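Job type: complex structure
Entries:
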Amino acid sequence: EVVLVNVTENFNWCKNDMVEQMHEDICSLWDQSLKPCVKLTPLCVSCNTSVITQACPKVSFEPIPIHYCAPAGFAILKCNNKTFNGTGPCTNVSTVQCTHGIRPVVSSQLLLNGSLAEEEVVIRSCNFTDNAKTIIVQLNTSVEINCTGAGHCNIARAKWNNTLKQIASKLREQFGNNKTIIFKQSSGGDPEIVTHWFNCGGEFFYCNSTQLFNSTWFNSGSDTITLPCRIKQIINMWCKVGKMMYAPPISGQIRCSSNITGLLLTRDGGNSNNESEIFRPGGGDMRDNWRSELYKYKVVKIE
Amino acid sequence: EVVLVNVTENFNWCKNDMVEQMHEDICSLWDQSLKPCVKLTPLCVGAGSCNTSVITQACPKVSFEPIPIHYCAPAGFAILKCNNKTFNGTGPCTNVSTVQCTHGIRPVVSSQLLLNGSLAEEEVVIRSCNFTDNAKTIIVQLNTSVEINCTGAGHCNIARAKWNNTLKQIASKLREQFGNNKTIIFKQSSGGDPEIVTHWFNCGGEFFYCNSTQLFNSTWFNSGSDTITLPCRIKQIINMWCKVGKMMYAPPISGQIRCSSNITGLLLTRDGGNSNNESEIFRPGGGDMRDNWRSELYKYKVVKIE
Amino acid sequence: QVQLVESGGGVVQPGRSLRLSCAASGFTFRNYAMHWVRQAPGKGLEWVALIKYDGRNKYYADSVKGRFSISRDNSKNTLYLEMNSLRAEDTAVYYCARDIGLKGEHYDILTAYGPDYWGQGALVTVSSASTKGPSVFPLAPSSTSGGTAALGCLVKDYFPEPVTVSWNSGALTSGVHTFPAVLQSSGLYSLSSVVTVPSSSLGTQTYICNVNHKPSNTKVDKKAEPKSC
Amino acid sequence: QVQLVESGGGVVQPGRSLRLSCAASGFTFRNYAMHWVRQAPGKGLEWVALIKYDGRNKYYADSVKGRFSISRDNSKNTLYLEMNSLRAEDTAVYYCARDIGLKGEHYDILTAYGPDYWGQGALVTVSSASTKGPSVFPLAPSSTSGGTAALGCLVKDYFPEPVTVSWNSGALTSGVHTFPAVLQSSGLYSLSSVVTVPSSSLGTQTYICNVNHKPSNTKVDKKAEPKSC
Amino acid sequence: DIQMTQSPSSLSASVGDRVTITCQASQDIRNYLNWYQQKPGKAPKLLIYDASNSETGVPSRFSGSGSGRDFTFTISSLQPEDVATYYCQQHQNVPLTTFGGGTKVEIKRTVAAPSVFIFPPSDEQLKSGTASVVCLLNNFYPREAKVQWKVDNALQSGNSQESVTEQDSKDSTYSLSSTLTLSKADYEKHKVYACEVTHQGLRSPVTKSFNRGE
Amino acid sequence: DIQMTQSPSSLSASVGDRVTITCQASQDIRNYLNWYQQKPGKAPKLLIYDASNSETGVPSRFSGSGSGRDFTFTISSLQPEDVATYYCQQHQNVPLTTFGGGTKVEIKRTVAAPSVFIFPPSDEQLKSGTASVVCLLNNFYPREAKVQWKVDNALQSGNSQESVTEQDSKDSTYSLSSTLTLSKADYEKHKVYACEVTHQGLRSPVTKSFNRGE
Ligand SMILES: *[C@@H]1O[C@H](CO)[C@@H](O)[C@H](O)[C@H]1NC(C)=O
Ligand SMILES: *[C@@H]1O[C@H](CO)[C@@H](O)[C@H](O)[C@H]1NC(C)=O
Ligand SMILES: *[C@@H]1O[C@H](CO)[C@@H](O)[C@H](O)[C@H]1NC(C)=O
Ligand SMILES: *[C@@H]1O[C@H](CO)[C@@H](O)[C@H](O)[C@H]1NC(C)=O
Ligand SMILES: *[C@@H]1O[C@H](CO)[C@@H](O)[C@H](O)[C@H]1NC(C)=O
Ligand SMILES: *[C@@H]1O[C@H](CO)[C@@H](O)[C@H](O)[C@H]1NC(C)=O
Ligand SMILES: *[C@@H]1O[C@H](CO)[C@@H](O)[C@H](O)[C@H]1NC(C)=O
Ligand SMILES: *[C@@H]1O[C@H](CO)[C@@H](O)[C@H](O)[C@H]1NC(C)=O
Ligand SMILES: *[C@@H]1O[C@H](CO)[C@@H](O)[C@H](O)[C@H]1NC(C)=O
Ligand SMILES: *[C@@H]1O[C@H](CO)[C@@H](O)[C@H](O)[C@H]1NC(C)=O
Ligand SMILES: *[C@@H]1O[C@H](CO)[C@@H](O)[C@H](O)[C@H]1NC(C)=O
Ligand SMILES: *[C@@H]1O[C@H](CO)[C@@H](O)[C@H](O)[C@H]1NC(C)=O
Ligand SMILES: *[C@@H]1O[C@H](CO)[C@@H](O)[C@H](O)[C@H]1NC(C)=O
Ligand SMILES: *[C@@H]1O[C@H](CO)[C@@H](O)[C@H](O)[C@H]1NC(C)=O
Ligand SMILES: *[C@@H]1O[C@H](CO)[C@@H](O)[C@H](O)[C@H]1NC(C)=O
Ligand SMILES: *[C@@H]1O[C@H](CO)[C@@H](O)[C@H](O)[C@H]1NC(C)=O
Ligand SMILES: *[C@@H]1O[C@H](CO)[C@@H](O)[C@H](O)[C@H]1NC(C)=O
Ligand SMILES: *[C@@H]1O[C@H](CO)[C@@H](O)[C@H](O)[C@H]1NC(C)=O
Ligand SMILES: *[C@@H]1O[C@H](CO)[C@@H](O)[C@H](O)[C@H]1NC(C)=O
Ligand SMILES: *[C@@H]1O[C@H](CO)[C@@H](O)[C@H](O)[C@H]1NC(C)=O
Ligand SMILES: *[C@@H]1O[C@H](CO)[C@@H](O)[C@H](O)[C@H]1NC(C)=O
Ligand SMILES: *[C@@H]1O[C@H](CO)[C@@H](O)[C@H](O)[C@H]1NC(C)=O
Ligand SMILES: *[C@@H]1O[C@H](CO)[C@@H](O)[C@H](O)[C@H]1NC(C)=O
Ligand SMILES: *[C@@H]1O[C@H](CO)[C@@H](O)[C@H](O)[C@H]1NC(C)=O
Ligand SMILES: *[C@@H]1O[C@H](CO)[C@@H](O)[C@H](O)[C@H]1NC(C)=O
Ligand SMILES: *[C@@H]1O[C@H](CO)[C@@H](O)[C@H](O)[C@H]1NC(C)=O
Ligand SMILES: *[C@@H]1O[C@H](CO)[C@@H](O)[C@H](O)[C@H]1NC(C)=O
Ligand SMILES: *[C@@H]1O[C@H](CO)[C@@H](O)[C@H](O)[C@H]1NC(C)=O
């Protein structure tokens, strides 16, 4: 809205109350969406005519964007530095009344329907030296992932392999330029944090993401990876504001399958400091999710 | 010789080069000695008629006696002598003499007991280069000598009464240095080479090793025979004979020199650590001859004659 | 080094409340569901409570619904279980266990998958009695006395359980027989502990009775030795 | 606390000289005669030199007369032994010992009465070779695996002797088997060290290989852990 | 809320044999069933998870099978230390449940004689006021054993408590302990304290006596 | 300069037995003779001084006797940890002398089987270039034991070194170690590495194998 000139402010995303608020409040919300097309097919008996008909009736439910708006008498400071790291002073700053359009999506391991990084791949951590702190990866190119209710998700293996390389490299760039980067399945735990767990409005997918995190990098099958899924409903995870409970759309109703724009890795510490580093799919902590999108905002008083 | 008036000097016997010199050089040296006596007996003839008397000379036995050695101040120097009858070695003496030569010292190698030495003038004196260092040897100097009779047969005799009393005096002067209400304990040597575990001493050429366990076996202020007899072993030690240059000096032969002398001092060593509560423990020490020499040279210091 | 250490055992009088803890280590605690299981002295295993990883969803047995409270601080890697209105029937050993993850079992999605690692237990006794220290007495050998001889200790008059006995600081195991405690008429416990050794070494060896009644900070050490002067 | 600590061990090439020391403590040093005794690796005990208390009289074996020098500073409670023209046959362990005093059970005045306390020894190797650090490798367990399992370390390629190995900082002794070093064809030594533990604790316990080649200021610590991911 | 049944409640079986325990659920639970093994005193252990899966580290001889409402834990070759209580658990639902008390397996071995000992009251204890006389029956089988007390040949009653270990893991032999508690006043009285034991593999009652001297 | 003789040079003896060692001096040395005991690795210890005197702390079972040229060290009842080498020393003269090598006493016990283990080369070592495969024979008796190496069933020679501990002080059992050293080049080649051991109390050769597929 109004770009501050020459002015620099201090950001600290790991101490940002937007994240906490946005996380306590905020539900998903779906609206009906019509995506009409036309089919015009030839009519041959002498191919004189042609019958144009409209026919993409299917009504689907689509996620509604939520914006966090600065309260009365306050504003939001926005970093425009395309490769900002969260903490520190931004030399290029804007002032907006509202954050961008966030489509809340509960999930672990993979960040869905999110904001791609503008320049190159970005990795972030509240503290890289603390192996417990979750690492947030933000691709600059989204990887399409097709999930059917039948119980499986598809991912172009070529696209994934390449996405891994980019991640591995930006990690090799954070933990010693000549380190071997290893991706391994989750070390174990509750289903939500061991599988690629995510919502499709009401229904929850648990996906065997073991094939996504099973490779070694810089160590001198099919054309499409298919993930096994279980699909369970979770009413207790439904939106509950006061007395009202909000029942999300029914099934074939909402379109499962989205775009991967981020990951949630966790680093293996201890006796892992020498020949190589090991990263496993993490998350299960939704605050990390919200930070993935709110790193570049901070709320202040309008002086 | 010439007593300095009103002048005071600084003494430090634990840094006194006389001791070192006197110790490196200096041998014993014995000279023949005639100690003649005359006997006179009456000549009784009949009854009451003891008119005459017969004077006759006796006591032929020739013995060898130790020759006194004096340390004499070099050319252009002199010796300062403390006259303070109870001096402690270190410090300023307010009464001083100037002599050309030290007194007559009769060198006698020994441990535990100091023989043929100088008795203290007033009361019993104890000395140490540092009383707080249990390692530093304590030098006791009696004011009354205890006769000790040693025969070649292999034993030494000491009047127990005289010893017991000598112990008391020592114990008391120690009780006076380590807390006036401490129990003083005398115990045998803790162990070591024979020379430092026995009352070891020379009798010219021959060396006595004596079981002085009966002399140091008592507790004091904790509220047999008339003569103590010490067992002795007598060994020769040529390597301890005087060797000045090419010449070796063979000391007198045996019945030649008269073994047995006068105890005038002791060499005690204090047991430290844990024994710092109600009682203190002292054991016969020495074996370090420099301590012996200090026992006699505490009151001397060599200086330039200005 | 997957370890689960319970702490907060002891006594508590009928009606009062107690809170036990479980110091978990050697595995990302904030990723596993945790179980509380109790075992009446001498009886079977009874599942008490469960809590999912994030600490939200909790699940209780009907035998506790409304009296017990399971919780967790994924920041102190500790699991908690506070118990209110303790009856005489709650007197039991309390284990905490880690729920198996979601092993690649081909799997379906269940609430729990069952415990794998358990803690070493924590004894809780609901009694209106007071604690007491153990009096340790020797049992000495005798004079066939040309083969093997048996000795030991006698831990008598204490409360409550337990009293872990060892020998020579743990440097002697084979032959040891620590008996189950007996409940006397004085409401106080008592147990014995014996061992077998070669009587050809009843004069050149030392044996030590290492009692440890922790609930009363007691740690006695007694010596076993033959008599006759 | 009668202690005699030798120091100054190490290497020295044939022809050179070396001087060893013995920090004595816990007994009036200036009162006892001191002994030097050596022991060819694997062979018997050979008395080398003696020195009386005052430091005067010294006594040597015919196997050293004119090459070795015994001495002492009764002020630093230290005993010394300088050795010149070291041959390949002088390669041995060198002990210092305190001569028994003159106990009452003796009755004659001898030159020496024999050693009572010895030092823990100091290794001296007469070699024209150079020292080298040990490379430490693990020996991990396996998968009956329902009883007891054995693990350990491998200390390989070093020089000279010795390399004192311990476990868990000394908190594990029973079961340990540190083998004698083997002389390879590369003139470098190598030894192994194993231990037996319950395979019912190969997942809840930590073991540490504490190597210490002091002659080269090496102090490695390696972890023993089962494989399969 | 699912009811679990195990069979048998208890069973004796010689070492080397094959022990079979059956689990039977009130309703279909697919293959969601775990088998646990609790030795005496120690804490439970996971042996089989989800019907037929061996934990890692778990000995090679333990197996599981079944699905639906019928399951089966099985030791191929019993070993001396396999003596414990075995529970089966279902997780098709909360609350989790088992057969309360599970199945206690115990070893049958060759009748072994009870090495009997007797320890008189410690001096340190004659002071406190109460005198406790002990009696040991070491490493014996079977568990059945009559212990009796005698003072100057006078059988005692009521004032005696006994305590017996659970079956040994190495040699499968029980060990018993009987204590006679009397005040220091009833102790000085009598001179000859005795202990008469009767065990199957003991052709005739053994005894162990003494007195307040030597 | 006095020559000392000891007998025997070495001797095996069961625990509990009485061991007698004789010392014999070339010339009369009165009673000036000390007995020393050197365990494996550790530093010598004084047991008896001046023929027949027990040091303080020295166990009650060690004694000495004799005078002149004939002496006798004696353990009344051998114990497991008494296994060491024993020297006698004379101090009637300098230089001091003993019987070089003294008397090595070793325990005879019940034949025990060698629990055999096998450890493949550590990954950390496949890097350095040289692969060392180990083989353990733990707590066994007697010391005699043939160890063999096999790769894909191909007996090796020359490239093997072994090292065996001295007799244990607790259970009187030796432990052996055999290492097979080959370069990383000769390692990748073969798949099945084996270790065949033969011990008296081992009715038939035991083996332990594996492969580079863990
Ligand atoms: C911002 O920085 C530029 C370049 O350094 C400077 O010339 C300018 O004065 C600053 N801002 C404004 C508003 O001019
Ligand atoms: C962007 O971010 C980087 C790294 O955090 C920072 O060093 C730099 O100053 C920023 N650049 C801009 C364009 O503000
Ligand atoms: C962000 O940038 C600042 C400097 O602009 C730097 O100090 C800080 O380390 C960076 N943070 C991260 C997480 O890299
Ligand atoms: C601020 O952001 C703009 C794009 O929004 C871009 O030109 C640059 O990163 C920044 N400009 C300044 C003031 O440097
Ligand atoms: C995305 O970022 C990576 C650096 O991580 C870069 O190599 C790649 O070219 C970028 N792709 C696009 C299209 O921006
Ligand atoms: C991050 O964590 C490490 C280890 O816990 C700590 O030493 C470091 O100070 C932390 N870094 C910051 C910036 O707080
Ligand atoms: C998913 O479906 C889309 C059509 O919308 C297709 O273009 C894409 O290739 C599929 N994604 C993958 C990776 O299979
Ligand atoms: C990417 O994946 C392919 C398989 O589809 C693999 O063969 C190749 O090594 C990978 N290439 C990269 C990015 O290194
Ligand atoms: C995991 O990765 C390995 C090595 O890249 C490969 O051989 C295998 O196909 C994968 N296996 C699993 C469990 O997905
Ligand atoms: C070091 O970096 C290179 C990439 O330049 C990588 O291929 C190599 O494997 C690394 N070194 C090793 C062997 O770990
Ligand atoms: C992601 O976005 C697409 C298109 O906006 C939507 O159809 C889909 O439902 C979203 N996926 C999830 C998991 O919300
Ligand atoms: C992924 O993003 C692109 C561009 O927004 C869109 O065309 C595609 O349908 C998305 N995939 C899904 C499943 O939302
Ligand atoms: C691995 O560990 C060492 C310390 O042992 C460390 O200094 C370094 O980062 C690594 N070593 C190498 C070869 O880089
Ligand atoms: C020396 O000292 C004494 C006593 O202090 C003093 O009276 C006197 O005047 C001084 N000098 C002389 C020799 O008179
Ligand atoms: C001699 O010295 C002592 C101290 O040891 C001192 O007290 C005394 O006063 C001195 N004698 C005289 C008469 O000055
Ligand atoms: C010894 O006596 C002197 C007097 O000559 C006195 O000044 C000093 O305090 C005493 N010194 C010691 C250490 O006893
Ligand atoms: C000096 O010594 C003499 C005794 O020899 C005597 O006059 C008195 O002790 C001292 N004189 C002084 C200065 O009082
Ligand atoms: C010697 O001095 C002491 C005081 O230590 C005293 O008791 C004793 O009577 C004195 N003897 C003579 C005769 O001076
Ligand atoms: C005296 O002894 C104490 C105790 O050892 C020591 O600390 C002090 O330095 C000594 N004083 C002198 C001057 O030597
Ligand atoms: C020492 O000799 C004298 C005679 O000179 C004698 O009177 C004394 O009794 C002897 N020693 C003792 C005290 O027995
Ligand atoms: C002196 O010695 C006698 C024994 O000869 C002893 O009984 C007495 O107590 C001692 N008396 C003194 C001087 O305290
Ligand atoms: C010390 O004296 C006592 C009598 O008081 C005597 O029995 C004993 O023999 C003496 N002690 C020693 C070590 O000889
Ligand atoms: C003084 O001496 C007595 C012995 O008569 C001793 O027992 C006591 O401890 C001492 N008194 C004190 C404590 O000063
Ligand atoms: C001590 O002095 C006397 C008399 O001068 C002498 O006869 C005797 O030989 C001396 N004793 C010793 C041991 O030197
Ligand atoms: C011992 O002392 C006195 C001098 O006080 C002397 O007359 C006597 O002859 C001496 N005896 C010996 C053995 O020197
Ligand atoms: C110091 O006094 C205590 C108390 O009487 C005593 O037990 C201890 O033995 C004494 N210290 C020494 C070293 O004798
Ligand atoms: C998921 O399935 C793969 C094979 O598709 C299997 O290797 C892996 O064990 C499973 N992972 C999990 C965590 O269920
Ligand atoms: C000397 O004799 C005493 C008394 O018989 C005895 O206690 C001691 O052993 C002997 N002393 C020494 C150090 O030989």
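Summary: Chain C touches chain F at residues 200-201, 203-204 (CB under 8 Å). The longest strand of chain C covers residues 148-158.
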